[PDB]
Each structure stands twice: as C-alpha cells, then as structure tokens.
Amino acid sequence: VHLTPEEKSAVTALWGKVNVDEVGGEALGRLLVVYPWTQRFFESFGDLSTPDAVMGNPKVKAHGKKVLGAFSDGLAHLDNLKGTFATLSELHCDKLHVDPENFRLLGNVLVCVLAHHFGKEFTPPVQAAYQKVVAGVANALAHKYH
C-alpha cells in the first residue's frame, strides 16, 4: 500500500492523540458486539452476553491493547507491512484459521472508533488515509492465505 506524504501526515498526526490503553479495547469490543460470530474465537474471555459485559470485560480491554500495539507497529513501518505482520499472519491464518474478511471488519471498526473519538477532526481525507492503512494491515495479516 502507498500512502502519500499528506496521507502519512494525516495518519501520524491523529495517531499521536490516540489513547493507546483504551482505543484497542474499544475496537475489539465493538467487533465482538457488532459482528457476534467473532466471539467464537474468544470463548475463554468469559462474560460476553451483553454489549456492556463485552465492553467492560477486562480481558477484552487487555487483548485490545495488544491489537492496537500491532496497528501502531504497522504505522511505524508503512512500507514493510508484510514483514511487520509475518508472525501474526502465521498465528491468525495457519493456527487460528480466522477468515481474513474479519481483518477488514476490525479495521473498519477501528475507523468507526476513530471517527467517534475525533468527530469533525476525522475528516473525509483523514479517513481515506486511514482506510489505506487498515486495508494494508488486513492484507499483510492475510499473507499466509495468499
């Protein structure tokens, strides 16, 4: 994926304001609520019975923090997403067998979370830059299927 300098600027400027202890949990939780089949992979997380239970579930927050850490790592290596995500690709594809469509869904959920958090600041060009990023991460995470 190829981000222009203006797109890189848009992405990094916003990301610097992200609360990295919360946003990942927020995105993972919303994934589990909005696309409930994904709960299949998180049976050990316990109570996922209601939206409030999901969002307040400490393991959801903890795991989301790890997910976001990986997005941050991609943001720092936009020109080598494949290598950055290589070991995670083996995990999600070879070991977990998550359908890669769900990588796209999570990315789009993150985009919704950023829009909710930043409001008017999350402009259409800023979103477009972020869509390139999350598409890139999804494609890299899915490399073992390719």
């Binding site: 939780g29 919303r30 609520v33 909005v34 939206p51 999901v54 969002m55 789009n108 985009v111 919704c112 979370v113 829009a115 909710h116 930043f118 409001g119 008017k120 999350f122 259409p124 060009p125 979103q127 477009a128 869509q131």
Partner: protein, 141 residues
C-alpha cells in the same frame, strides 16, 4: 432481522441526526469517493469535488431513502422496491459497493453523534444498513 431494540436504536439515532440528514448523506458519499476510489466510476457526469451541488443533491436523496426505510422499517422491500430496480437493472451497481457506502454512513454518524453512537446503537445501525443493502441488491436478473 431487526429486533424491537434495533428499531428503537435506529429511530433514536436518526432522530438526533434530525434535519442534518441531507448534509450527512452528502458527507458519506464524499467519504466513499475518497476512501474507495473505484466507486467514482458510477458518477462520470458528476463533479465529485468538495462542495459539489450534485453530490449535495444526491446526498439529500440518499438520506430521504434511508428515512423512508426507517419510517417503514417492517416493509422495507416494498418501500425501497423502485430504488432496488434502479440500482440493479439500470445502474448495475456492484453489490460490494453497498458495504462501502454503508461503512461510510456509519463513519459519518459516528463523527456527528458522540453520545448516540454507543456499541449497541452502532450494532443496530449496522444491521439496519445491511438490511437496506440486502433490499437494494435483491433485484439482479
């Protein structure tokens, strides 16, 4: 299948959107054009630049269709029948593209509805736009 709670949530969100619906429709379209450039090919006769009267006009119509769906939520196939004919038969809109605009509609609502865009309402809105998309792609022949 939209539940009673889903219908409540969707009605609540669109109530808050209120009279900004047309503006938000235009914004969602712009987000789609910028984020997913393949979608632009359906609009060769549009100027898609920011502030375009044509995008604004279409945004109003899109919003009107969605409001019609909300208002007749238990009869959406009938309500959107003419629009499903248009998008499938005449426009030949790739079904993939409905997911793209649906996402951009959610993003737009999220960017304008700090209090309302809870995870539950997010889920309800996604189901609603999936239902609309299902009707709008039901008429390929």
């Amino acid at each position: 299948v939209l539940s009673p709670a889903d219908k409540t949530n969707v009605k609540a969100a669109w109530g808050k959107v209120g009279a900004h619906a047309g503006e938000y429709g235009a914004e969602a379209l712009e987000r789609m054009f910028l984020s997913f450039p393949t979608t632009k090919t359906y609009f060769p006769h549009f100027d898609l630049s920011h502030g375009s009267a044509q995008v604004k006009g279409l945004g109003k119509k899109v919003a009107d269709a969605l409001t019609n769906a909300v208002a007749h939520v238990d009869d959406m196939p009938n309500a959107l029948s003419a629009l499903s004919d248009l998008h499938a038969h005449k426009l030949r809109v790739d079904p993939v593209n409905f997911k793209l605009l649906s996402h951009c509609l959610l993003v737009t609502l999220a960017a304008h509805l700090p209090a309302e865009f809870t995870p539950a309402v997010h889920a309800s809105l996604d189901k609603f736009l999936a239902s609309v998309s299902t009707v709008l792609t039901s008429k390929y022949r």
